[PDB]
Symmetry: C2
């Protein structure tokens, strides 16, 4: 049998006509019923002798379009989720008896879609390989369920959940998880939901806090004897930024003539051989502490 | 819903009445249909304005008993196996619509019952422990199936088979088997078939052929010296009867003064000690050969 589909709030026309009417055969009455599937309840009746009858609760939403001996077609207005079910149309005739046809009514609903990030702060620490939630994509109260997916360059794993609501709509939820990293920071994650031929997209960017990646600038390989005023600068790539800096060497402390001031190691000069060595910067932010090195050799 | 049952050839009354008729509600038409279970075909229609309509193939077997605005009751006459199925009765009314009720029709049939023996000859031989068929009890073309069982003092095993006929009747067959024996001969075997509260019984007696059970009569323990005219008689219980008799002794042949003539060993006399010994009769029938013994001691 036929299947009709319509969205909540719209109207459907349910066709029902009597094929080959004969001079012999006479149409007595045309009857629409709804089977909520054992239960038959009467919806609307058309009797040529007595006119039209639409029963509650359909009195304001149902109507015959062109009620006649041959046409029992009706419009069901302002669809409701509960309109779903099987509809039977019956022509009672004499002396030949009953002729019935059936159809299925499915009611459809467009979902409400939205992405959301975690309220938690994302942290990237070595030794932390824990995958965590970074975003949730929801398609709520749709029918049939929509398809949810993700667009991103991030390398994570998505989990999917489908909730069957009491009213027959389905909520689809996807949860995106990854182990937070320095490279993930500021990067984008989009959730995509496909319903029929519609396509919804919403994006967000990740905020990921990570310990310092430190490098040392300043040594140009031309630190010649007697040169004046050279310095090393500790570059701490850190989110949030480093709060604290500490300089040391591989063999002990700093030499006389080398002064530390936060991220800078000043070599006032004149440069001499006793300044060669390996200089280390230890940088600290709220996430952790990391070191960086530079090997200084004195030239000329 | 209701279930009706009737035997082939009988009539059933299928009830259908409209409960609480109101001044408001008006009955348009009463319709009987048969659902052979997807298919609805029209059986009979009653329309107050236009009268009665019974459709083929029901024109001579269906009739409304008291056709009115409230009563759609019909008689289905001379039941046929194919009448089985679901019957729907529908009151079309205005402005309230359709009211239907259903019922199941099951058609019943009494079986034809009979016992029968094997055409084979039953044989009892030592070393033959083969169970064989001795009787078959059939209950043919019944609906529902009848219960088949056996009454007998014999110690055998019954096998049961149920054949589902194309028309929906069931044939029940039971096969009785036993290893044939001398004691089974002439003994009775009855098959019993219960249908509803009826009880059918039919008996037969077994004919079993067996080799000879031989005993020796004639020695009275008073075979005193010089006694004249005594004899031994070989009694062969055999079916069919023994055809042949042979006498011998444990130690050789017969003594002078002892003459054999079929089942008789004549001791003419006078009796003397040389006549003591063990005398054997070997009796043969179409089934086998068996021996019998008697120890003769001479007295006084």
């Amino acid at each position: 049998n036929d299947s009709m589909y319509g969205f909540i709030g719209t109207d459907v026309v349910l066709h029902c006509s009597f094929a080959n009417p004969l001079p012999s055969v006479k149409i007595t009455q045309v009857t629409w019923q709804k089977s909520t599937n054992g239960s038959k309840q009467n919806v609307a009746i058309y009797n040529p002798s007595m006119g039209v009858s639409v029963l509650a609760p359909y009195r304001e939403r149902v109507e015959f379009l062109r009620p006649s001996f041959t046409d029992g077609t009706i419009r069901l207005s302002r669809l409701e989720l509960e309109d779903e079910g099987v509809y039977i149309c019956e022509f009672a005739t004499f002396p030949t008896g009953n002729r019935e046809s059936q159809l299925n009514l499915t009611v459809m609903a467009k979902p409400t879609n939205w992405i959301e990030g975690t309220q938690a702060v994302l942290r990237a620490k070595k030794g932390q390989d824990d995958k965590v939630l970074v975003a949730t994509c929801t398609s709520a109260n749709g029918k049939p369920p929509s398809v949810v997916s993700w667009e991103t360059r991030l390398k994570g794993e998505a989990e999917y959940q489908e909730i069957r609501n009491p009213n027959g709509t389905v909520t689809v939820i996807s949860r995106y998880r990854l182990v937070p990293s320095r490279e993930a920071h500021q990067q984008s994650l989009a959730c995509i939901v496909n319903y029929h031929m519609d396509r919804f997209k919403e994006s967000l960017t990740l905020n990921v806090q990570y310990e310092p990646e430190v490098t040392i600038e300043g040594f140009d390989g031309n630190w010649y004897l007697q040169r004046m005023d050279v310095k090393l600068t500790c570059k701490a790539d850190a989110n949030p930024p480093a709060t604290e800096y500490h300089w040391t060497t591989l063999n002990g402390s700093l030499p006389k003539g080398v002064e530390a001031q936060n991220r800078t190691l000043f070599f006032k000069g004149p440069i001499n051989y006793s300044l060669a060595g390996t200089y280390i910067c230890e940088a600290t932010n709220p996430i952790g502490t990391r070191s960086g090195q530079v090997e200084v050799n004195i030239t000329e």
